[PDB]
């Protein structure tokens, strides 16, 4: 286990240092997206929540291919506003329901430290 709490103020500094193996040690789901919504990183805890295989979703587009239920003003709309503004830090509850049992989660989206990358963090509620 890596000891990082969901919603920590400086989480993007802490995560900047982790390779894929370290990301898999987090207590919550973590997805790293580029500015277009393509998946660069996808950890084991997220795959436990959603059933997706972390190795197979890398390189897919989160909003178009993997998670169409997030293609909406309430999720994707906030993401694209943050990408265009260059800043993003929002936390909200959502239901994941595409090809899975509907699962209520808390979502935290935050701009990463490195250039054109954005984090999506996920835990059950």
Ligand X SMILES: *C(=O)/C=C/c1ccc(O)cc1
Is residue 30 a contact point for Cl ion (CB under 5 A)?
no
Binding segment (CB under 6 A) for ligand X, from list 8-16, 20-28, 63-71, 81-89: 63-71
Is residue 40 a contact point for ligand X (CB under 6 A)?
no
Residue 62 corresponds to which tokens in the numbers above?
Answer: 């989160």
Of the candidates 35, 38, 40, which has an alpha carbon nearest to the alpha carbon of residue 23? 40
Report in angstroms how near the CB of residue 63 gets to ligand X at its nearest.
9
How many Å apart are CA 31 and CA 10, to the nearest integer? 17
Report in angstroms how near the CB of residue 46 gets to ligand X at its nearest.
5
Is residue 24 a contact point for ligand X (CB under 6 A)?
no
Q: Contact residues for Cl ion (CB under 5 A)?
A: 16, 52-53, 56, 112-114
């Amino acid at each position: 286990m890596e000891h990082v709490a969901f919603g920590s103020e400086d989480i993007e500094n802490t995560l900047a240092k982790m390779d894929d193996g370290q990301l898999d040690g987090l207590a919550f789901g973590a997805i790293q997206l580029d500015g277009d919504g393509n998946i660069l990183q996808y950890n084991a805890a997220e795959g436990d929540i959603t059933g997706r295989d972390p190795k197979q979703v890398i390189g897919k587009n989160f909003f178009k291919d993997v998670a169409p239920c997030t293609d909406s003003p309430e999720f994707y709309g906030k993401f694209k506003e943050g990408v265009a503004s260059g800043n993003l830090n929002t936390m909200f509850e959502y239901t994941f329901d595409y090809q899975m049992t509907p699962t209520k989660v808390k979502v935290h989206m935050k701009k990463a430290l490195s250039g054109d990358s954005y984090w999506v963090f996920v835990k059950r509620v």
